[PDB]
């Protein structure tokens, strides 16, 4: 596990040199919007049931064959363990929003993901369309001007999209 | 490696859940003291491959027998001494990383585990260091609280040589 | 799944050797149901469709909040009943399932596990469910034996649901 | 596990379809001729050690080199080891009648038996001639007129010949 | 297998390190009855096949009911007798070759692990073989240190077939 | 795990054959040069540190990079491990001298010991070459004339080298 400190520590140290000023800066950077990005670390916690439930529902009506008998995800152990699933890619996008860094989701999470997914006759294409809808909602409440002070965190917005899209894309 | 952020994740991670308040208001307390620990960092960045060399000599003046003694791991030759002052530095680098990380990570994994196995091994003594280190300590000339999180990890390193 | 004869396979087999006469007797016993049991199938397999639109709105009579409340995952509008009839619908076909086996392997694995961690968080209630489900048991008017087996495991769908 | 019912309730629920009326009648079926399937699965069960130990005899019989110095079953350890396996054949085609399915013996037993078997330098054909031997002495004793009602026990016969050509065909 | 050179490797492995003194000593005793050892070997490797048809026969006479009663795992049948001559050798053969490793090795994991569990199922009785292994025991007539080592295998082939 | 011994038992067992007289004359002969070869083993034994440590300083001075900032042996975790993994090599090879065949050796230790470190972003050839280091110190203590009965132990030290070279072959 690595995070958005530690990784540029990580770097200077394959070169042995002592951390730039400009990097400093960089970080400098971080520690100002810091604020900000627990707002948003927060939000998405508080939301967290709501964001998941509904994206699941947006995907039941988009493709519902996938949930009926037959489909790779009928019965309740697998309905439930679907839902399971996507409330963990939240939970992993959270963790990397907190940190700065990808690392933990990578590795703690999709990891071997896709193979899983896979050899499992699970869709993948339909979890990534999954992790989609999930992140709408994520952005329309994490980005919510009531209740707190009002300001830009349009940078914080732009590294979240970032996450739930390399999400779906290690299993698509 | 090890940083707050990160040892929070991992306590979150092995029970499942979001952070708890406890380890969020622990987290908020880290980016209260960042910018002191960056201001650490640039003040290593600058001045410390300097405090290298003047270490270098402290410890000579401790320790004459590392440089006269015919040296299979001394620093007797002209070539050891060089090595006397990478020595150093690697700890100061490693030292100010960890200013900025806001923890003892760094010198966890860099140079922490695994150092007795070896010094005791190739024959280095830690009193060499330990010494060397104590002299960057006072002469660094560090303000107050730029000093404070830099001096702490410091005694740190000194806590796992002795 | 799990039917009686797996059960006594899984027996034998923990333990390397062939049946125990217990466990044979205990599966002879089996064959001596089957036929009262595939009799209860049977009656599911023709007049169970019904049985689920007949739960379907006994079930608004005792939830009148159901049909009418905004319904984000209630039958309010007409497209939610529609999956509240096939919801009545899959235990029915799941429990006819179990006469079949002999036992609660489908109802076990096809919708037991795994069933509050799902309900209570899509906001659907398991009281709705329970209700409409003792309607069909006193309704169908099945014989005795063929009834005995029938009853069996929709008592065992209602405790779980519990 | 899946047993003969389980496996049609299984087929029924991929289309979510309550059992059709022949499918009830063909298990009725299965439900008729239950004393004779179990005379079957008893007989073998009694008859267990005399089955394996002659399948042996008269497979080394067969290929002698196999058994002597140099042979791949050389050594009591092996000796005994061969024996063990055969009864396990043996056990699993029992299971597989008294359930009227074969997946306890494809899962928990034939899985992964032809690579072991490889990767451990057994000749593997020799095994399949030891089923073949197994399984002559098998039907002889489940098919002996003497101490059973008189009936016709066929079809039973002919689905306990396809558990052993099955285990066969799976190492060879 | 298991020679006393690699029971010591064995122990040193296990604590990651190299050969203690007592394992040293022990294992500069075991070079010092290697001849010995060597020789009994030697003795076997010659009149050996021999000592094998003369158990043959004696056991015959302790057991007559094993030359006649119609065998189907008996030695009735002259070709049955052929293997039990045969029998006899690989017992001798697999001793000959402890006096050689200087251990139980050979016997542990040629002719010890798995024994019973298929004599007693073929219908093999240990009774037969003890006694036909006494006969070579007395008989051999080995001096008395190469009679020592070649003894000392014999017995303890006897005690695990008791 | 085998040993001299144990190795010509097994191959004699193969052929199912009483040991031929040359076989034990073959013996004879290890048991001759016993006393000389506990001798190796226990000089290797003692001077054990001193070997490792000088064969990783002539190899730090030999590819300096490889222990420096961005080396695949940078950091103290790293280097002890690296000094480690030398005096494993030694170790195993002394077992192999004290056994007489290199079995041990083989699957104890190098067994899949090339894998490992190439997946692990580790040299190989600088392994070699710092078995080829510690192989020369080892051959130099092991034939000092001084301390001990004079004497030819030349075949022990042909039989010393080629273990060293099995090992650094392994890595390469
Ligand atoms: C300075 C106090 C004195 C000097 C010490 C000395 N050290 C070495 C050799 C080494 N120094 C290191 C240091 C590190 N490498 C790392 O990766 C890390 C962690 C980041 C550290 C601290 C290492 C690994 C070595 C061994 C390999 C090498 O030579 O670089 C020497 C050379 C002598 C030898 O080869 O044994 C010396 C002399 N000597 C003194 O007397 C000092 C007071
Ligand atoms: C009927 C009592 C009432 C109705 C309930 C209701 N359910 C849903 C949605 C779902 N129903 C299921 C049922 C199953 N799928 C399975 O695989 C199994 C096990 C075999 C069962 C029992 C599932 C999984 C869902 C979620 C996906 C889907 O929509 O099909 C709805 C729709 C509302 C929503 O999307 O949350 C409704 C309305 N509503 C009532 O008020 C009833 C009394
Ligand atoms: C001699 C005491 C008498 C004789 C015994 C007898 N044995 C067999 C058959 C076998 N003998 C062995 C022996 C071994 N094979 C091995 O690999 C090892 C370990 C090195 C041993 C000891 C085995 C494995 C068999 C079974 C296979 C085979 O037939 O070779 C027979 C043949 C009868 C049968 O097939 O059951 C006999 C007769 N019989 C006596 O009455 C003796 C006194
Ligand atoms: C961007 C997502 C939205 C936004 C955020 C924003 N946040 C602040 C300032 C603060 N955020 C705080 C967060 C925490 N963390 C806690 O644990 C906690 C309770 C103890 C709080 C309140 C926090 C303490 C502050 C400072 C005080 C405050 O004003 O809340 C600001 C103001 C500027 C700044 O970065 O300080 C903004 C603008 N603003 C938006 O428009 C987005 C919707
Ligand atoms: C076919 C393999 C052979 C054959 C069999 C056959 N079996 C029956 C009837 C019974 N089989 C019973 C089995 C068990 N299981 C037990 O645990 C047990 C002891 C408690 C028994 C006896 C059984 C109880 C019956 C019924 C009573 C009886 O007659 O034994 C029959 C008769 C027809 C039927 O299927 O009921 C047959 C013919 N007949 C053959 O010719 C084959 C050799
Ligand atoms: C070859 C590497 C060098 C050499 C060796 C050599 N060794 C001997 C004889 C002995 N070696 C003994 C070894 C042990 N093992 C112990 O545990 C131990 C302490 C209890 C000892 C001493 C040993 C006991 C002997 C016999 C007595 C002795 O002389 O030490 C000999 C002599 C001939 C022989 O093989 O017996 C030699 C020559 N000689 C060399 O020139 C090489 C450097
Ligand atoms: C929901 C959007 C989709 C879906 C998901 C689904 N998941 C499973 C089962 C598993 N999911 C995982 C993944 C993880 N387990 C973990 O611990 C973590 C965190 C590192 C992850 C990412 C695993 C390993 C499994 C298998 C083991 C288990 O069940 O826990 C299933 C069940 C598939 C089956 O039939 O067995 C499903 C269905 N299914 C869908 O249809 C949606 C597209
Ligand atoms: C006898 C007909 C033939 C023969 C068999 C033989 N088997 C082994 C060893 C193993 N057999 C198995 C198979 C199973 N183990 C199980 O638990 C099950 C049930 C699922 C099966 C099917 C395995 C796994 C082994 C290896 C582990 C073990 O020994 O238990 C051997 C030994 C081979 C060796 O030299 O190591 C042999 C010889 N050998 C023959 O020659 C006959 C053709
Ligand atoms: C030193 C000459 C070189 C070097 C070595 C090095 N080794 C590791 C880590 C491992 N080494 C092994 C090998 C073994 N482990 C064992 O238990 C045994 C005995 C059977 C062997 C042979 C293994 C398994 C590892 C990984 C696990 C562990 O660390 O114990 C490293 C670390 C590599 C890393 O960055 O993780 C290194 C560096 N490195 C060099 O540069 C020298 C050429």
């Known amino acids: ?172 | 490696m090890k940083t707050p952020l990160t040892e929070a994740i991992a306590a979150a991670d092995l029970r499942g859940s979001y952070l708890s308040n406890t380890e969020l208001q622990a987290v908020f307390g880290r980016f209260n003291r960042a910018r002191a620990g960056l201001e650490a960092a640039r003040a290593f960045a600058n001045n410390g491959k300097k405090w290298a060399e003047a270490a270098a000599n402290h410890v000579y003046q401790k320790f004459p027998y590392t440089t006269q003694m015919q040296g299979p791991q001394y620093a007797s030759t002209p070539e050891g001494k060089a090595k006397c002052v990478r020595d150093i530095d690697h700890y100061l680098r490693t030292i100010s990383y960890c200013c900025v990380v806001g923890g003892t990570g760094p010198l966890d994994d860099y140079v922490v585990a695994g150092l007795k196995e070896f010094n005791s091994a190739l024959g280095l003594s830690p009193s060499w260091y330990i010494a060397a280190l104590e002299f960057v300590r006072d002469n660094h000339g560090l303000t107050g609280d730029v000093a404070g999180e830099a001096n702490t990890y410091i005694n740190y390193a000194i806590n796992a040589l002795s």
């Open chain 1, 1 to 172: 596990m690595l995070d958005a400190f530690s990784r540029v520590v990580e770097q200077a140290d394959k070169k042995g040199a002592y951390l730039s000023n400009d990097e400093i800066n960089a970080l400098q950077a971080i520690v100002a919007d810091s604020n900000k990005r627990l707002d948003v670390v927060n939000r998405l916690t508080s939301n967290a049931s709501s964001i998941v439930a509904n994206a699941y529902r947006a995907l039941v009506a988009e493709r519902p064959q996938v949930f009926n008998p037959g489909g790779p995800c009928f019965h309740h152990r697998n309905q439930a363990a679907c839902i399971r699933d996507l409330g963990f890619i939240l939970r992993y996008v959270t963790y990397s929003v907190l940190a700065g860094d990808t690392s933990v989701m990578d590795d703690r999470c999709l990891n071997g993901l896709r193979e899983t997914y896979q050899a499992l006759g699970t869709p993948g294409d339909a979890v990534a369309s999954g992790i989609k809808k999930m992140k709408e909602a994520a952005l329309k409440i994490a980005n919510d001007p009531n209740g707190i002070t009002k300001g830009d965190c349009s940078q914080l917005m732009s590294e979240l999209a970032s996450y739930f899209d390399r999400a779906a894309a290690a299993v698509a």
